[PDB]
Design a protein around this ligand. Sequence first.
Ligand SMILES: *[C@@H]1O[C@H](CO)[C@@H](O[C@@H]2O[C@H](CO)[C@@H](O)[C@H](O)[C@H]2NC(C)=O)[C@H](O)[C@H]1NC(C)=O
Length: 361
Amino acid sequence: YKLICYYTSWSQYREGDGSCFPDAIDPFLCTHVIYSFANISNNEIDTWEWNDVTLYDTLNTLKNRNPNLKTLLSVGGWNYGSQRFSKIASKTQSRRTFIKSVPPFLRTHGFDGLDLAWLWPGWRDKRHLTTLVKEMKAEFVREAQAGTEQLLLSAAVTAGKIAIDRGYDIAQISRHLDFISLLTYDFHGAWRQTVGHHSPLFRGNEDASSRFSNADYAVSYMLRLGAPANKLVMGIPTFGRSYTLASSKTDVGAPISGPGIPGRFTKWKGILAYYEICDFLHGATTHRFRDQQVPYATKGNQWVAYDDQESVKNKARYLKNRQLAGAMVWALDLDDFRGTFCGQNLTFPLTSAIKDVLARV
Ligand SMILES: *[C@@H]1O[C@H](CO)[C@@H](O[C@@H]2O[C@H](CO)[C@@H](O)[C@H](O)[C@H]2NC(C)=O)[C@H](O)[C@H]1NC(C)=O
């Protein structure tokens, strides 16, 4: 099994226990840790926050404890516009400078591969990733003739029908990537005004349109597109999405006035870290959609759509049955990495649950 576990750079600024450095990360836990994004400046990869060079050394030493543990840097992200990305891989001047620019960098810092997080390319881009990604690997195969372990190249891909079709030539980009992470917690989110679960496993026999919106379809689709089994990694949320209810209506179908308040540690509108959610559950009403096989919680005006131990194992089982390459956990820093908020003295409750399913077979 492969268990790619992202780590986000900025989680360091969370106050108190919220704060998480390459420190709290178990070296034996996942197989691949990906430092969440980098930046680009003067068409040459570059760091993002100020002390990255150090965090790049905190994280990469975990490998001294687990010689098999592989690390990766991701380029792109939410806070990195498509425009800047789309402007780099169409002007072959800018594309080839950026390429040549990263093997050295990744080497210098001990990263074993690069992970492209071009957050959703447009229909005018499908042609451009294709060759950006393509020859990135021509470079990587070339650098490897220097007598060293070939750098790895992977991509984070959206999981929405429309989103995939629009800007991804999966069939061809699958034969140059080492693995693909399916953002399979990409289905409901923020707000055309109904309460919904962002990462459903199955359909929910209840509504018809938006079958497209679930992990099973996303997965069958990708395989049908031509993406090999042994190269698909199914994304699993370690966080939840919050919603301020607009009405005493709580069952799914209920109105939404807005985004959910922040957690005291996470401080984002509409997002909650699993550890924050564990405290939220105290005094709550827990629910679970039987077919999508995922839970949600409500307290006061707040409505939370999230994943707990079993919902995540269930996914883990699904992943194993179709014979995928492995699982992906969005943010190690959104799990209970301190393992002090969620009752059981277990640390990284969620990411372990997956591991367990992926391990006892
Ligand atoms: C990412 O790299 C860019 C490269 O210029 C850094 O620069 C800013 O972005 C605009 C767009 O070109 C520039 O015109 C401004 O001069 C810059 N603004 C700032 C805040 O200095 C950018 O800072 C890098 N990103 C991070 C956060 O690491």
